[PDB]
Amino acid sequence: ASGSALIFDEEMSRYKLLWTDPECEIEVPERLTVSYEALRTHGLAQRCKAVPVRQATEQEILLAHSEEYLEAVKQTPGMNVEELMAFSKKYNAVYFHQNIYHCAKLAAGATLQLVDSVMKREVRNGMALVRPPGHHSQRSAANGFCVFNNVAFAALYAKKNYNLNRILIVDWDVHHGQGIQYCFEEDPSVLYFSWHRYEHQSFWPNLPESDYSSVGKGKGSGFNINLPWNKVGMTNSDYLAAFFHVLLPVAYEFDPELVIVSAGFDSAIGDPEGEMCALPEIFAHLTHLLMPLAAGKMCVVLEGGYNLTSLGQSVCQTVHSLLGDPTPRISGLGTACDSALESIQNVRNVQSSYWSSFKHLAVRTVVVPPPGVELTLPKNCQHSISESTAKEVQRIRDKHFTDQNILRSLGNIISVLDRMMRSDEVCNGCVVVSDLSVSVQCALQHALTEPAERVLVVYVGDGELPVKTNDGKVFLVQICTKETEDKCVNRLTLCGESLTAGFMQALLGLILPVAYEFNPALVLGIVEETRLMRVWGHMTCLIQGLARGRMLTLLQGYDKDLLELTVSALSGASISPLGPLRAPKPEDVEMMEKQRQRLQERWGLLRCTVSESW
Ligand SMILES: NCCCc1ccc(C(=O)CS)cc1
Ligand SMILES: [K+]
Ligand SMILES: [K+]
Numbered sequence: 001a002s003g004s005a006l007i008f009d010e011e012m013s014r015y016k017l018l019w020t021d022p023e024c025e026i027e028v029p030e031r032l033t034v035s036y037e038a039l040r041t042h043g044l045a046q047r048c049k050a051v052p053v054r055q056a057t058e059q060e061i062l063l064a065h066s067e068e069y070l071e072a073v074k075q076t077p078g079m080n081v082e083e084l085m086a087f088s089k090k091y092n093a094v095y096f097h098q099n100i101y102h103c104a105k106l107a108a109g110a111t112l113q114l115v116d117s118v119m120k121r122e123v124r125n126g127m128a129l130v131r132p133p134g135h136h137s138q139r140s141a142a143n144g145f146c147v148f149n150n151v152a153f154a155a156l157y158a159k160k161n162y163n164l165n166r167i168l169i170v171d172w173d174v175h176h177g178q179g180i181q182y183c184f185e186e187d188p189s190v191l192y193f194s195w196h197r198y199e200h201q202s203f204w205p206n207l208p209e210s211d212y213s214s215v216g217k218g219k220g221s222g223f224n225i226n227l228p229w230n231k232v233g234m235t236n237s238d239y240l241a242a243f244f245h246v247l248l249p250v251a252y253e254f255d256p257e258l259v260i261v262s263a264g265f266d267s268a269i270g271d272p273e274g275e276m277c278a279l280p281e282i283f284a285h286l287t288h289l290l291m292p293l294a295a296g297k298m299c300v301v302l303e304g305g306y307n308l309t310s311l312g313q314s315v316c317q318t319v320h321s322l323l324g325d326p327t328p329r330i331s332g333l334g335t336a337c338d339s340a341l342e343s344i345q346n347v348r349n350v351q352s353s354y355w356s357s358f359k360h361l362a363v364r365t366v367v368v369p370p371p372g373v374e375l376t377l378p379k380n381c382q383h384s385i386s387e388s389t390a391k392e393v394q395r396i397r398d399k400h401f402t403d404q405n406i407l408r409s410l411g412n413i414i415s416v417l418d419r420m421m422r423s424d425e426v427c428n429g430c431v432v433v434s435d436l437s438v439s440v441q442c443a444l445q446h447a448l449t450e451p452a453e454r455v456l457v458v459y460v461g462d463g464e465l466p467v468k469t470n471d472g473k474v475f476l477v478q479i480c481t482k483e484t485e486d487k488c489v490n491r492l493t494l495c496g497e498s499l500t501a502g503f504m505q506a507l508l509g510l511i512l513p514v515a516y517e518f519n520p521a522l523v524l525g526i527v528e529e530t531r532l533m534r535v536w537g538h539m540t541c542l543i544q545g546l547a548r549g550r551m552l553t554l555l556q557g558y559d560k561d562l563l564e565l566t567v568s569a570l571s572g573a574s575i576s577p578l579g580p581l582r583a584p585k586p587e588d589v590e591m592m593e594k595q596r597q598r599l600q601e602r603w604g605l606l607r608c609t610v611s612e613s614w
């Protein structure tokens, strides 16, 4: 499966508000046009498979709505403006139009076309630019600019026509999609996550069940997660902390078979409804962080978003990530604000009785295989020295250290670094080396010599490496099997059956927050002398979210499986699911909490509880 589907039609922009109603004046047809033209101006729309729109059938509509409400809406095309206004007064924050029933059927049908495209392996993922939005509509009521619930349609449709048992819905719109929650509150097969402006119930829709204490009812208890922002102005740090410490661990433990996104961009800076301070680029990462789920099968559906400029920018960021283009570096990240930390600690505590991870106590890639080893590399890869490179190698040899093979590996390292950093030609790479010491020294020092302010080293093995963590230029993440006794603040040391769950927990809760706050210019991966076979691909894919994806992996020893997985993850292929994760060993959880308490003073992004005032 390859490619991304873009589903859009100008007909969904042919309905508008016909009377004066300041509540709805923001929901304009231009939202679609500005969006699509955005993807057109940046050349993104041309790279997507343009799947056409269809109407949703009556049975498909009845999957999520009542026949009475369907018959009521079905009659709006026959009403004049006075009758339409009277009909709109019967619901909250909603207007109807002569074409709105048609357009809502088109929006639902576009969502279903996207679901069919993704599940039939015709495309890897995709986005649907639809209108009206859906996540506020309920079984027998239009609500909040929404007529029919597109995402609930998608989930129920996937369940019915593909026998899916686990679906994840991520609603990053700034409003609480109460329609989806109502639809799946007793359903443990569809996990609904939603962050939303709440302000202690004073923000629309002013529902007590939008609060963190609504975990779902009945058999679906623990499969409805609400994260209420109780203050405006939430930044990139708040969003990323919500992902790292709430959504992503639950998601990877859940192991969904399909991910559907209520992509509402009224949660971005500039929007008059959300009033948050998140830059559009954050949506490149919110997308990217979810790609390893469901083997990449992601369905992005448009919801809110009303600042035309920031809306176009955020849509472009999302599509950029869906196509696999390098995610942009996010700087200035730090601790979440106190209100966000309160919301996060509350939702974690209440959900801990369902997810034990929350309990507390009081050419894209290049490949340098061993000489003579001919490999079958994917279409986004290529193989490998010059006079300048050989001169630099001779210089470092006569200055700091006669194998000829190690010299070849060093020249290849210098060449791939030059191609990654001093050019847009190559993004990331992988080299099989012999001597780990000399290879790592050359790699790190030459990366620092190139315009690389900071470097994030990720070493899997034991013993000490030749890398100094004194100055604020290098951060080391060591995955070992021996004692830690960590002392430096620029290092994260980590020490067989429960190893997969523990490693994923450590990656989502400790590695990614520190690494995102660090904002490196180059990630340098090392693997000594094979439990890593279970997790290494996920780590590579998730760590590519930094340094614009520029990652140089050094592998000490040939392993066809490990090399294949490394290059596949680096080149952007789909990651295979880990299977439903379980519980890590309690000693490992205690060790992770100790590392967090050790590092969270310097690295605020590690916090998931409001700090204690001395
Ligand atoms: N009268 C204030 C609340 C009215 C309202 C309702 C919904 C939205 C959305 O953005 C839907 S995604 C916006 C405004
Ligand atoms: K939401
Ligand atoms: K649910």
Ligand SMILES: [Zn+2]
Residues within 6 Å of the ligand: 173, 174, 175, 264, 266, 303, 304, 305
């Ligand atoms: Zn909204």
